[PDB]
């Protein structure tokens, strides 16, 4: 490409489709486009797993006491009722109030 | 505006107010040489730093195969049809997509921005 | 009053709210189980709807106690679900759309 | 689409492109070109889906 | 300008009247709501070489249960304040026997003056307020839920219901701007009432430490 | 700060086998160029451009106090691997450093000092070109820069 | 936040020993206008002149007054500095500045004046609140940033009002200023919510942020777990980092 | 460039660069530069002609090989940072021939473009019809295939 070309072809817009097949420069630009995806895939996993571990380590002792109060290992009270409505989260569904609006 | 050097040790002069005659001077600190200030201006700073880049564009740029050229815009001096154009090619240009033109053909090197 | 409370709790008017039991599926289950015909007049007494809901909301217990602090605790815990439950089980709604015997 | 992109670029060469408030000329330029190209690929997509 | 400064002083006085109202001290309905032009007609426009000097903006208010406690609000005229100045203020305090007062500081306090505020707990308690902190009422912000300072009997019944030691409650530090807003001391419990999108209302109890 | 606001941007060098930063003009005078017209003659290739002149101006005022070569070699020598007990030991040491561990590809022997000026000035010069924005900052990943 | 450098086209330090000398071509006019009745010069006038230019675009875009700039320079530096300026009629907008007159009544002068310039260009703080880099203005199409009022029918009406979004944050002084809504103003930064609005605004705010980032992808995580994370973080009474 | 194309004083390995705006002229004889061959274009016409391919198809028992094709100045080695000074064409019969004007000055044309692919990626039939992560995955697995 010629210097100072901002046109669609020079900067990587791909006109062809996978069925017809790419041109060479569109193929190289395409490889550049995929490399970022592979790199994101490889890099994100470590940070996600480490954040997961930190969350689990910080929360690990939180539980529902027989008072339904949510207390950590030290009996300090995080919440008086679980989820503030005191209900488990699996059995709920979405609803419409219909008195509102 | 510019810097001038001493005529004895070739060191950097500095501005000094003349207190008696109220005339600006430049006096080397490593000797006694003194010369009056002709320009009367010392420190100029352009914050917008607007500078015609026609001063920074070399005519040899007309020999580059990698640059685009058009026959639409003729030269002013020689009226040559080939004109090789390029953008600022500079960092901290503010925002300029303006095309700069350089005349091809030997030694003309005329530069007109449109 | 419940409508005003909802308008305090839900600005921007988002009506999609997560609640434990789906009242529309349960009502329209009852219609199909007991073979209700909407083309016929209902035999249901409009009071026993209200008394059914009032006697109902006492038997849904998040907080166990006779203390006034416990009373306000249970009202604040079950508030929104009681508003929804009084919305869908309303007497005129029984006597218009649902035709529940 | 590519002809429209050529039109926009040839506008930017003559400085006629006015910067959108909050955007450098490069930012508004890339914004416009992205608008045009995304419109292209979206329209062609919908066509292939029809 | 004096319009800006007067507008600031109007914000400050109004917000301090809301302070005084939320702590249970007697305030007439006019004292809470004063249109800017009524305030200006009262205190006379421009501060600079003007009617308000930052003195006579001082406020004296009485408690609802007993009139004796009252309260006081000083506005210092200095950019920064020092032990001698506060000492004059406490001299006026012991002169009027009123125990509780406030200070609205334009900029800052020398740390010896802060330590001198902490020095005497029983006799007279003084609370530093920066000028900006009173330029806005934070309790009326959307994120800040309604706070209710609990009396000791309600706290005892609370700890009796859930069978809690005082240490097992969540905490709120005495340097928390809301705790300042209500003038709360170590050992008291606050009752937060906030709406939830599951239950619809939820009550938190925050011990003050 | 009061001094930082007045001076502007000072150019300093990090040399091998030397403890800390050193200003540039002391390094140029340590190569035997006393006058500022020779130093700014090697740094700035055309004096008719005032912008580069204004760029270089503070670096001279920072180094103003050392006008002598041997005093500059003393300036560098005290920062060496170990401080020389006797003075001229430091001058000989810093001189050996400027001959050997300074820019070995230019030359290792004696009069190469002169050449050691030009290329080194080039550094400073090119640095100025990145300060004025007249050139692009090199991309570390460009594979022309890789061997 | 607009520093004096943003609106300043260029700066030149001149040596004029006399007021009416005026080495510049244009300056002599208004110089003589102010020196027909020269005031506060009784001590003496410093020979060192500082002449800065102001681009009319940056000046009129921010609704800046030359008198206002004179008030902020003369107020910031006090009586140690003297400000002289054009009427707007001048096509080239000029601001002339001189060192303290009573200073004539170390540091040299030109060096001290260069230090003055380099202190002004960064330091001045003409308008706004420092640490605010830019402020963006738009009409939001999202129902979260739209003001939704209950009308006289009890219906929910969504209104379009201009909103601002700033690059960089100072929450308190923005909350303090006039015409800004105290109720609905919020920042994403947690700490600047903590030291201003307290721990509860950090509870609900942190909660809204986690819900924003988790539900931005299109994913849905239940309320209870966010509500728990915010509580466990804010339970101890102050922000507990997870570290 | 002539003396390199004739391999007189300059080995074909040396790379030479003229950077016009910085006025420099660089010559790299250094080791480690990764460089690839390219056809040479004079005006719009290739220097590779019919007699060259005639002798290369007869290559057996002519003792005529690639080295004699380099000695004819037809093909030339170019490295990374010299590619910044070059204009390449994908294929001669496409980009060399006249159309609505894009570029004239083309100085080179790649041999064949598919040579940009490595060893493991050269066994993929129709790699341009695939998503690029799949060309990568195949470059990974093709190493593990039994044979
Ligand atoms: Zn001299
Ligand atoms: Zn010409």
Swiss-Prot record, chain B:
GO CC field: nucleolus; nucleus; RNA polymerase II, core complex
Residue ranges covered by zinc fingers (C4-type): 6-31
GO molecular function, one term: zinc ion binding
Homology family: Belongs to the archaeal RpoM/eukaryotic RPA12/RPB9/RPC11 RNA polymerase family.
SMART domains: RPOL9, ZnF_C2C2
Gene3D superfamilies to which the protein is assigned, alphabetical: 2.20.25.10
Species of origin: Bos taurus
Keyword Isomerase: no
Protein location: Nucleus, Nucleolus
Function field: DNA-dependent RNA polymerase catalyzes the transcription of DNA into RNA using the four ribonucleoside triphosphates as substrates. Component of RNA polymerase II which synthesizes mRNA precursors and many functional non-coding RNAs. Pol II is the central component of the basal RNA polymerase II transcription machinery. It is composed of mobile elements that move relative to each other. POLR2I/RPB9 is part of the upper jaw surrounding the central large cleft and thought to grab the incoming DNA template.
Annotated Zn(2+) 2 binding sites: 75, 78, 103, 108
Quaternary structure annotation from Swiss-Prot or TrEMBL: Component of the RNA polymerase II (Pol II) core complex consisting of 12 subunits: a ten-subunit catalytic core composed of POLR2A/RPB1, POLR2B/RPB2, POLR2C/RPB3, POLR2I/RPB9, POLR2J/RPB11, POLR2E/RPABC1, POLR2F/RPABC2, POLR2H/RPABC3, POLR2K/RPABC4 and POLR2L/RPABC5 and a mobile stalk composed of two subunits POLR2D/RPB4 and POLR2G/RPB7, protruding from the core and functioning primarily in transcription initiation. Part of Pol II(G) complex, in which Pol II core associates with an additional subunit POLR2M; unlike conventional Pol II, Pol II(G) functions as a transcriptional repressor.
Protein name, UniProt field: DNA-directed RNA polymerase II subunit RPB9
Annotated keywords: Acetylation, DNA-directed RNA polymerase, Metal-binding, Nucleus, Transcription, Zinc, Zinc-finger
Swiss-Prot record, chain E:
InterPro entries linked to this entry: Arch_Rpo5/euc_Rpb5, RNA_pol_Rpb5_N, RNA_pol_Rpb5_N_sf, RNA_pol_subH/Rpb5_C, RNA_pol_subH/Rpb5_CS, RPB5-like_sf
Major localisation: nucleus
UniProtKB keywords: Acetylation, DNA-directed RNA polymerase, Isopeptide bond, Nucleus, Transcription, Ubl conjugation
GO BP, sorted A to Z: transcription by RNA polymerase II; transcription elongation by RNA polymerase I; tRNA transcription by RNA polymerase III
Domain of life of the source: Eukaryota
Pfam families reported for this sequence: RNA_pol_Rpb5_C, RNA_pol_Rpb5_N
Any Gene Ontology CC annotation: RNA polymerase III complex
GO MF annotation terms: DNA binding; DNA-directed RNA polymerase activity
Cellular compartments annotated: Nucleus; Nucleus, Nucleolus
Glycyl lysine isopeptide (Lys-Gly) (interchain with G-Cter in SUMO2) crosslink, residue number(s): 80
Keyword Ubl conjugation (UniProt): yes
Record family assignment: Belongs to the archaeal Rpo5/eukaryotic RPB5 RNA polymerase subunit family.
Subunit and interaction comment: Component of the RNA polymerase I (Pol I), RNA polymerase II (Pol II) and RNA polymerase III (Pol III) complexes consisting of at least 13, 12 and 17 subunits, respectively. Pol I complex consists of a ten-subunit catalytic core composed of POLR1A/RPA1, POLR1B/RPA2, POLR1C/RPAC1, POLR1D/RPAC2, POLR1H/RPA12, POLR2E/RPABC1, POLR2F/RPABC2, POLR2H/RPABC3, POLR2K/RPABC4 and POLR2L/RPABC5; a mobile stalk subunit POLR1F/RPA43 protruding from the core and additional subunits homologous to general transcription factors POLR1E/RPA49 and POLR1G/RPA34.
Entry function: DNA-dependent RNA polymerase catalyzes the transcription of DNA into RNA using the four ribonucleoside triphosphates as substrates. Common component of RNA polymerases I, II and III which synthesize ribosomal RNA precursors, mRNA precursors and many functional non-coding RNAs, and small RNAs, such as 5S rRNA and tRNAs, respectively. Pol II is the central component of the basal RNA polymerase II transcription machinery. Pols are composed of mobile elements that move relative to each other.
NCBIfam families found in the cross-reference section: PRK09570.1
Protein name: DNA-directed RNA polymerases I, II, and III subunit RPABC1
UniProtKB/Swiss-Prot annotation, chain F:
Protein name: DNA-directed RNA polymerase II subunit RPB2
Organism: Bos taurus
Role noted for this protein: Catalytic core component of RNA polymerase II (Pol II), a DNA-dependent RNA polymerase which synthesizes mRNA precursors and many functional non-coding RNAs using the four ribonucleoside triphosphates as substrates. Pol II-mediated transcription cycle proceeds through transcription initiation, transcription elongation and transcription termination stages.
Coiled-coil stretches: none
Family the entry assigns: Belongs to the RNA polymerase beta chain family.
Subcellular location: Nucleus
Subunit relationships: Component of the RNA polymerase II (Pol II) core complex consisting of 12 subunits: a ten-subunit catalytic core composed of POLR2A/RPB1, POLR2B/RPB2, POLR2C/RPB3, POLR2I/RPB9, POLR2J/RPB11, POLR2E/RPABC1, POLR2F/RPABC2, POLR2H/RPABC3, POLR2K/RPABC4 and POLR2L/RPABC5 and a mobile stalk composed of two subunits POLR2D/RPB4 and POLR2G/RPB7, protruding from the core and functioning primarily in transcription initiation. Part of Pol II(G) complex, in which Pol II core associates with an additional subunit POLR2M; unlike conventional Pol II, Pol II(G) functions as a transcriptional repressor.
């Amino acid at each position: 490409f010629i210097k100072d070309d901002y046109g669609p072809e020079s900067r990587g817009f791909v006109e062809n489709s996978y069925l017809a097949g790419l041109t060479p420069t569109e193929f190289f630009f395409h490889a550049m486009g995929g490399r970022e995806g592979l790199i994101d895939t490889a890099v994100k996993t470590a940070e996600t797993g480490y954040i997961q571990r930190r969350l689990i380590k910080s929360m690990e002792s939180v539980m529902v006491k027989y008072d339904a109060t949510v207390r950590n290992s030290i009996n300090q009270v995080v919440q008086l009722r679980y989820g503030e409505d005191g209900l488990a989260g699996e059995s709920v569904e979405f609803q419409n109030l219909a008195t509102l609006k | 505006v510019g810097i001038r050097f001493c005529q004895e040790c070739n060191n950097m002069l500095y501005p000094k107010e003349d207190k008696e005659n109220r005339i600006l001077l430049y006096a080397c600190r490593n000797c006694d040489y003194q010369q009056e200030a002709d320009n009367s201006c010392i420190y100029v700073n352009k914050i917008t730093h607007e500078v015609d880049e026609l001063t920074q564009i070399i005519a040899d740029v007309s020999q580059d195969p990698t640059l685009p050229r058009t026959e639409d815009h003729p030269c002013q001096k020689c009226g040559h049809k080939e004109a090789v154009f390029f953008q600022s090619h500079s960092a901290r240009a503010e925002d300029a997509m303006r095309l700069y033109y350089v005349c091809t053909a030997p030694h003309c090197g005329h530069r007109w921005t449109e | 009053e419940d409508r005003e409370v909802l308008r305090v709790i839900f600005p921007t008017g988002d009506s999609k709210v997560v609640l434990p039991c789906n009242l529309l599926r349960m009502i329209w289950n009852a219609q199909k189980i007991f073979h209700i015909n909407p083309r016929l007049p209902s035999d249901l007494h409009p009071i026993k709807v209200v008394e059914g809901v009032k006697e109902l909301s006492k038997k849904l217990v998040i907080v166990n106690g006779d203390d006034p602090l416990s009373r306000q605790a249970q009202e604040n815990a079950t508030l929104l679900f009681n508003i929804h439950l009084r919305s869908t089980l309303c007497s005129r709604r029984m006597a218009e759309e649902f035709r529940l015997s | 689409a590519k002809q429209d992109v050529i039109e926009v670029i040839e506008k930017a060469h003559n400085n006629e492109l006015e910067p959108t408030p909050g955007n450098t000329l490069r930012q508004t330029f890339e914004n416009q070109v992205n608008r045009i190209l995304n419109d292209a690929r979206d329209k062609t997509g919908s066509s292939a889906q029809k | 300008d004096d319009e800006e400064e007067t507008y600031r002083l109007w914000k400050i006085r109004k917000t301090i009247m809301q302070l005084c109202h939320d702590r249970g001290y007697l305030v007439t309905q006019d004292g809470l709501d004063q249109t800017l032009e009524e305030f200006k007609a009262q205190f006379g426009g421009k501060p600079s070489e003007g009617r308000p000097r930052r003195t006579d903006l001082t406020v004296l208010v009485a408690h609802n249960d007993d009139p004796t406690d009252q309260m006081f609000v000083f506005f210092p005229e200095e950019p920064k304040v020092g032990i001698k100045t506060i000492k004059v203020y406490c001299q006026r305090m012991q002169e009027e026997n009123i125990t509780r007062a406030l200070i609205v500081v334009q900029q800052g306090m020398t740390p010896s003056a802060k330590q001198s505020l902490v020095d005497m707990a029983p006799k007279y308690i003084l609370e530093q307020f920066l000028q900006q902190e009173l330029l806005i009422n934070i309790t009326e912000h959307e994120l800040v839920p309604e706070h209710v300072v609990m009396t000791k009997e309600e706290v005892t019944e609370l700890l009796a219901r859930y069978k809690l030691r005082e240490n097992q409650l969540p905490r709120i530090q005495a340097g928390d701007p809301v705790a300042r807003y209500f003038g709360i001391k170590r050992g008291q419990v606050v009752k937060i009432i906030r709406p939830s999108e599951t239950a619809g209302r939820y009550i938190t109890y925050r011990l003050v430490q | 700060g009061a001094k930082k606001s007045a001076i502007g941007q000072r150019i300093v060098a990090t040399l091998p086998y030397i403890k800390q930063e050193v200003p540039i003009i002391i390094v140029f005078r340590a190569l035997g160029f006393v006058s500022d017209r020779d130093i700014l003659e090697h740094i700035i290739y055309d004096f008719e451009d005032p912008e580069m002149m204004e760029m270089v101006k503070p670096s001279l005022d920072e180094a103003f106090v050392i006008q002598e070569q041997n005093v500059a070699l003393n300036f560098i020598g005290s920062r060496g691997a170990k401080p020389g007990v006797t003075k001229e030991k430091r001058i000989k040491y810093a001189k050996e450093v400027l001959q050997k561990e300074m820019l070995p590809h230019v030359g290792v022997s004696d009069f190469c000092e002169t050449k050691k000026a030009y290329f080194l000035g080039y550094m400073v010069h090119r640095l100025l070109l990145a300060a004025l924005g007249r050139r692009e900052l090199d991309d570390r990943d460009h594979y022309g820069n890789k061997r | 936040h607009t520093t004096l450098r943003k609106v300043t086209a260029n700066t030149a330090i001149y040596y004029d020993p006399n007021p009416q000398s005026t080495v510049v071509a244009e300056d002599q006019e208004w110089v003589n206008v102010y020196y027909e009745m020269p005031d506060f010069d009784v001590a003496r006038i410093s020979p060192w002149l500082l002449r800065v230019e102001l681009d009319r675009k940056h000046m009129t875009d921010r609704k800046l007054t030359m008198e206002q700039i004179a008030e902020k320079i003369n107020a910031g530096f006090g009586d140690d500095l003297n400000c002289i300026f054009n009427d707007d009629n001048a096509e080239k907008l000029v601001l002339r500045i001189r060192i303290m007159n009573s200073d004539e009544n170390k540091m040299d002068d030109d060096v001290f004046l260069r230090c003055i310039e380099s202190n002004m260009l960064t330091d001045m703080t003409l308008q706004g609140i420092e640490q605010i880099s830019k402020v963006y203005m738009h009409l939001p199409q999202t129902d979260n940033k739209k003001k939704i009022i209950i009308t006289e029918d009890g219906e929910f009406k969504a209104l379009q009002e201009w909103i601002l979004e700033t690059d960089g944050v100072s929450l308190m002084r923005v909350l303090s200023e006039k015409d800004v809504d105290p109720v609905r103003t919020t920042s994403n930064d947690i700490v600047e919510i903590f030291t201003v609005l307290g721990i509860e605004a950090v509870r609900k705010a942190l909660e809204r942020e986690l819900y924003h980032v988790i539900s931005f992808d299109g994913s849905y995580v239940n309320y209870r777990h966010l509500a728990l994370l915010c509580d466990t973080m804010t339970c101890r009474g102050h922000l507990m980092a997870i570290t | 460039r002539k003396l390199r194309r004739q391999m007189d004083i300059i080995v074909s390995e040396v790379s030479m660069i003229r950077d016009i705006r910085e006025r420099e002229i660089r010559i790299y004889t250094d080791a480690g530069r990764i460089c690839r061959p390219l056809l040479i274009v004079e005006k719009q016409k290739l220097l590779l002609k019919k007699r060259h391919i005639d002798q290369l198809k007869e290559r057996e028992y002519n003792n005529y090989s690639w080295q004699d094709l380099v000695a004819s100045g037809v093909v030339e080695y170019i490295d990374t940072l010299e590619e910044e000074t070059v204009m390449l064409a994908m294929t001669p019969d496409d980009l060399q021939e006249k159309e609505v004007a894009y570029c004239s000055t083309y100085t080179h044309c790649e041999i064949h473009p598919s040579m940009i692919l490595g060893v493991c990626a050269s066994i993929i039939p129709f790699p341009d019809h695939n998503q690029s992560p799949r060309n990568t995955y195949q470059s990974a697995m093709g190493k593990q295939a039994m044979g």
